[PDB]
Amino acid sequence: FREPRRIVIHRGSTGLGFNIVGGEDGEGIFISFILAGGPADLSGELRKGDQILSVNGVDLRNASHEQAAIALKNAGQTVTIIAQYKPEEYSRFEAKIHDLREQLMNSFPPWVQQTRV
Amino acid sequence: EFREPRRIVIHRGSTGLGFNIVGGEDGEGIFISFILAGGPADLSGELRKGDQILSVNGVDLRNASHEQAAIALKNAGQTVTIIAQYKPEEYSRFEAKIHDLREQLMNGSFPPWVQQTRV
């Protein structure tokens, strides 16, 4: 439905200012957390639930969570990214975790792989 | 096979100079995309679809960014000088890539997330 949206952003004393998840097997790379007010919310062109398709033209469509990671701290000086906002597919994740989570104990649990950047 | 650049003599009009530009990422280069028909660049018929813009007012653009070009086109003023060169091959492979990834992503012109300036 949605068209991807190109964004560029310059790191802070924080860094890029969002948390990443996904793409260790059959998933893909997604924005878990927009920090309040940092180099995300000040722009605000991103939200939790955009998948990150590109980082300076390297393709994260199929990328691995640590490839996604080497790329996006390596990303750089500044980094042309494209976000495809995909709400329906990111809830198809967050709840599976929560349901997974309610099942084994009889926001995100630490055993859910997520990488700060 | 590479072909002979040309020095192009064109002047600004109305709203526009008659086209827009693509490129500047990955050090690739700057290319026009389309030329607004009935516009100075179209009206002059010395510019076509799929050049690289090598220099404008002697500013070397080969390895340059997109917005530097975008302004060099908005920026120079009123008569401007362009060495352009025709590579429809590398522009197709360019567009074909883009066209080919759109439906991969979602499922003639280019989607909003790629820079193009109308100039």
Curated annotation (Swiss-Prot), chain B:
Palmitoylated. Palmitoylation is required for targeting to postsynaptic density, plasma membrane and synapses. Palmitoylation by ZDHHC2 occurs when the synaptic activity decreases and induces DLG4 synaptic clustering. Palmitoylation by ZDHHC15 regulates trafficking to the postsynaptic density and function in synaptogenesis. Palmitoylation may play a role in glutamate receptor GRIA1 synapse clustering. Depalmitoylated by ABHD17A and ABHD17B and to a lesser extent by ABHD17C, ABHD12, ABHD13, LYPLA1 and LYPLA2. Ubiquitinated by MDM2 in response to NMDA receptor activation, leading to proteasome-mediated degradation of DLG4 which is required for AMPA receptor endocytosis. The gene is DLG4. This is Disks large homolog 4. Postsynaptic scaffolding protein that plays a critical role in synaptogenesis and synaptic plasticity by providing a platform for the postsynaptic clustering of crucial synaptic proteins. Interacts with the cytoplasmic tail of NMDA receptor subunits and shaker-type potassium channels. Required for synaptic plasticity associated with NMDA receptor signaling. Overexpression or depletion of DLG4 changes the ratio of excitatory to inhibitory synapses in hippocampal neurons. May reduce the amplitude of ASIC3 acid-evoked currents by retaining the channel intracellularly. The PDZ domain 3 mediates interaction with ADR1B. The L27 domain near the N-terminus of isoform 2 is required for HGS/HRS-dependent targeting to postsynaptic density. Coiled coil: none annotated. Belongs to the MAGUK family. The lineage of its organism: Eukaryota, Metazoa, Chordata, Craniata, Vertebrata. It is found in: Cell membrane; Postsynaptic density; Synapse; Cytoplasm. Residues 7-87 form the PDZ domain. It is linked to Intellectual developmental disorder, autosomal dominant 62: An autosomal dominant form of intellectual disability, a disorder characterized by significantly below average general intellectual functioning associated with impairments in adaptive behavior and manifested during the developmental period. MRD62 is characterized by mild to moderately impaired intellectual development. Brain. Interacts through its PDZ domains with ANO2 and NETO1. Interacts through its first two PDZ domains with GRIN2A, GRIN2B, GRIN2C, GRIN2D. Interacts with ASIC3. Interacts with SEMA4C. Interacts with CXADR. Interacts with KCND2. Interacts with SYNGAP1. Interacts with LRRC4 and LRRC4B. Interacts with ERBB4. Interacts with KCNA1, KCNA2, KCNA3 and KCNA4. Interacts through its first PDZ domain with GRIK2, KCNA4 and CRIPT. Interacts through its second PDZ domain with the PDZ domain of NOS1 or the C-terminus of CAPON.
